Amino acid sequence: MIDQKIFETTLNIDDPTNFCTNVEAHLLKELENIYVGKCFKNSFILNITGVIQRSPCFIMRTNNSGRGYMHVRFSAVVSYLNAFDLIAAVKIIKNDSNIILGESLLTEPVTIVIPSSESQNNVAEVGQIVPVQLANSSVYYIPGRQQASATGSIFIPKHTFSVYHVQEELTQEQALNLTKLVNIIEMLLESRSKKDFKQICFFEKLYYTYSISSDEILDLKIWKGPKGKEMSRLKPCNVLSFLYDALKNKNSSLGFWARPPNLLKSSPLAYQQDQNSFNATELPIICSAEVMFVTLLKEIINYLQFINDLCDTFNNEQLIKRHENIWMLIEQRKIG
């Protein structure tokens, strides 16, 4: 997830007289040379946005070199990868008996180790681009490295889900905070709308937990995609509209919230009920409205980004025919 961050650092200056001429420009250039494209303080710095504040260029006191140093606090655009994150393009580099290596081709530099034990792996031949999902573990950001260390496997769609029992109302400040995620989802939806609809439908049908019976596209005037199975007589509710109405204090967030596999994970739909009617196989998670909303919004963001990057990477039928081996493997692991 691309985000902002603020760092502190100390930079050494060999020629203080030359540095003091255009201090802000020299500072930006040296910061870009040192920190851009490297992992530092549990994050990977993408760009240097600016310098919030600095210190006067002091002169080093413990040596007679005459050099200087300056403490700089700067805002940088960084990226942080989380567990269960969906990456739609990694290049298989090494395929040996021990492990499998891949490198992401997206704007999030990360090297991914893959265990050969899992059956979904060991099929991705060297040179194939396979969309993978990061495993339930932390992503290692080793200082000084141009990539991130992570573990994961080829993204096989899951068949289970989680139910959130909400006993707390959504406060105005929490809704205002969540409007940022709502804006992110909106921008992702408008970016998706510019892409090819055929590729969108193909990939959503491919990564559906179930199998779409026939061509039937569901439309909400803000998200367009194929329509799949339902849940008896239960109807889904739009999450974006619910959040917008909650900003005006017009809805109640209490009760059982769920996103069972019959819903398209890249769609803003969700199920809200007054009773635990979902046939889940675990105890419902007691949480506030804000926690459930954060989880669902980030899941929607993840799946929207996954579909968008998958369509970006595979822009022609030649790549699809090349990766039909992976596509059939994905298709096989589906519940009837």
């Binding site: 100390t10 930079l11 050494n12």
Partner: protein, 264 residues
């Protein structure tokens, strides 16, 4: 990436336990060999991960030459717990204060709440605690006596019955002490008595012991004699361990004491 200019503003002194030595160590010593041909043997006490003092090879840790390498500590896993030579007296002050059966303090903490922290534990241990009965487990506190034949052996005298407090028994006793007792006795949360017994010692960096000194012979003897102690050794208060194992434990603890506090 570059390291910015910095200066030291303050220095903090603490007691290093097993966790500090395990996380600050760059390798674990596992063999008593010294070389494999001309290069240092991997896993020995001269392993190049600890540093380098020869032109032939560079440091494996920082990839520097012997001039720019400051050395890196290693870890030696002791098969039996060992006491800290520098703080043996402190260990005594803790054995006479807390109960040896449940860890609850045998002295009244409220009696020392007005003293300053540096002398709270000293003044608590100065009082007569032998024969005092714990108010929780109802166990009579024995007499903690220092063996006069060495500098690190303790005995418990329960109404004439004498037991030897092996470092494993001392560690089990100390791990039963809560942080509330440590704070209320003037010590800090970084000076818990459980750190006074080491099951993993630090092999100093090669930069501290160049000449791949005579202190390296002590470490090599300590490494070789550590492997004589069985790994699965377990000591429980009251157990009569064989004289073969008891003799080996004495030398290992004495070797480490002479490694740190010889002729001091």
């Amino acid at each position: 990436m570059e390291a910015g200019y910095a200066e030291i503003a303050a220095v903090q002194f603490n007691i290093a336990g097993d966790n500090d030595h395990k996380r600050q160590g760059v390798m674990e010593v596992t063999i008593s060999n010294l070389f494999e041909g001309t290069l240092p043997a991997e896993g020995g006490i001269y392993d190049a991960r600890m540093g380098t003092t020869d032109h032939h090879y560079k440091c494996i840790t920082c990839s520097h030459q012997r001039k720019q390498c400051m050395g890196h500590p290693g870890i030696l896993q002791m098969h039996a717990p060992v006491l800290q030579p520098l703080f043996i007296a402190e260990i005594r002050r803790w054995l006479r204060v807390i109960c040896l059966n449940c860890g609850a303090p045998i002295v009244d903490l409220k009696r020392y709440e007005h003293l300053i922290r540096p002398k709270r534990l000293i003044e608590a241990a100065s009082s007569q605690t032998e024969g005092k009965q714990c108010y929780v487990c109802k166990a009579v506190h024995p007499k903690i006596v220092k063996d006069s034949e060495d500098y690190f052996t303790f005995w418990a005298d329960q109404q004439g019955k004498i037991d030897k407090l092996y470092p494993q028994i001392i560690r089990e006793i100390f791990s039963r002490v809560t942080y509330d007792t440590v704070v209320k006795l003037g010590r800090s949360k970084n000076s818990h008595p459980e750190k006074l017994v080491l099951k993993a010692i630090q092999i100093p960096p090669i930069s501290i012991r160049p000449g791949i000194h005579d202190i390296n012979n002590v470490i090599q003897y300590l490494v070789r004699k550590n492997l004589l102690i069985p790994k699965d050794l377990q000591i429980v208060r009251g157990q009569k361990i064989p004289l073969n194992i008891d003799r080996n434990l004495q030398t290992i603890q004495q070797l480490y004491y002479n490694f740190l506090l010889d002729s001091v």
